[PDB]
Ligand SMILES: O=C1c2ccccc2C(=O)c2c1cc(S(=O)(=O)O)c(O)c2O
């Protein structure tokens with residue numbers, strides 16, 4: 001009868017969520033911050049309590065979590081950060097808008113990437129404006145060459161998220177700790193795919209809403225007993 | 238030096254403006270106290286400081302100070318550890334009372350005694366106290382044993398429960414080469430400074446750490462300061 005809550009961060013600065021923000025450490029926009037506050041207020045109104053929180057090492061997710069903990073008066077909770085919950089690494093496309101992407105690689109190839117589970121985008125090369133910014137960022141200094149991506153397929157992203165789910169999060173849930181996870185579209189996709197046993201095609205069609213608490217009820221095998229539910233006023237739901 | 242340690246004491250709280258004893262009551266920062274934390278964070282940013290792990294209490298005036306600093310230095314991704322052992326001194330029955338109410342009920346002499354005493358506690362927070370359930374029954378302390386959860390603390394009590402965390406969880410991290418930031422409260426930080434500098438009870442009671450200001454220690458491999466604490470800023 002466990003309860004798990006997920007929350008996907010909202011809008012980031014400079015329209016970066018429509019520019020393959022990926023591993024670039026974009027902050028929330030004021031709008032994204034307000035979204036997180038609304039999500040937190042929904043959790044507060046519903047009287048939710050947590051015992052432990054997981055998030056990525058990207059400040060838009062961390063700030064989403066902080067906003068939520070502030071709203072629900074549980075700033076004292078233990079918080080665990082991991083690169084394994086980071087957004088998908090969009091490689092050389094990182095920072096580009098739709099037009100720039102199609103101009104550079106063509107519509108055909110974009111259609112293929114968009115629709116593919118196991119094809120990565122091109123690698124982020126040294127001439128990319130974010131190359132040293134991300135690859136030499138001190139928060140990833142303990143990662144091995146194989147762990148630090150230059151690019152990720154969705155398959156890759158899920159593959160590195162799920163070890164953390166199994167090794168760090170599952171044991172807490174089975175101890176009865178009430179878990180909050182604040183993360184990103186694709187890392188949360190990995191979790192949802194695992195929970196609901198979805199196909200590659202289905203998970204690629206699933207777009208989790210932003211700034212809205214997503215509630216799971218899990219049985220003793222960590223299988224959902226019902227569809228995911230969204231928290232908030234009747235309309236927003 | 239072999240190691241570098243940074244301490245920061247949170248600034249003004251909402252109850253400081255009311256002249257009320259907070260102790261374990263979870264008062265938030267005032268707007269002013271929050272600004273103090275931003276200025277401290279900007280001083281750490283200007284000085285180019287990097288950390289590897291952060292410790293704070295389970296009280297939001299300290300936690301928010303920490304968040305404010307991490308935001309300022311662009312290190313929100315750092316591991317953060319919270320512990321009740323770094324909480325402010327527990328002021329027992331005085332909790333919630335302002336200066337006037339305290340002197341009215343207990344007299345100037347008794348407040349004078351409590352003020353300057355290292356080892357005399359204030360009266361206990363009893364079950365009929367207005368904040369008794371608010372503090373003593375708060376679920377964040379549910380894992381504390383009976384003897385661990387205080388009804389009141391002398392400064393000696395406070396130091397006594399802070400230093401185990403220092404010895405068992407912070408010291409090992411420093412000797413592992415981790416650059417530590419501690420964001421906490423006047424009296425718990427007093428505990429750390431007292432252990433570090435080998436100060437007397439008298440000296441530690443005369444020590445008032447500035448608020449919102451990074452306090453920098455340079456330590457040898459045995460964690461002995463090699464010079465006086467330094468304050469960071471303009
Ligand atoms: O172009 C891409 C793309 C390119 C390279 C790697 C991954 C993706 C990708 O994942 C993607 C894309 C477009 C859309 S969109 O036009 O339908 O909004 C998506 O939804 C979407 O997920």
Ligand SMILES: O=C1c2ccccc2C(=O)c2c1cc(S(=O)(=O)O)c(O)c2O
Pocket residue numbers: 331348351352353359
């Ligand atoms: O009233 C107190 C007090 C009351 C009860 C227990 C402890 C203290 C105490 O420790 C204290 C006090 C006042 C001052 S102050 O008025 O000089 O700012 C202090 O500096 C200070 O340390």
Ligand SMILES: [Cl-]
Pocket residue numbers: 079317
């Ligand atoms: Cl945190």
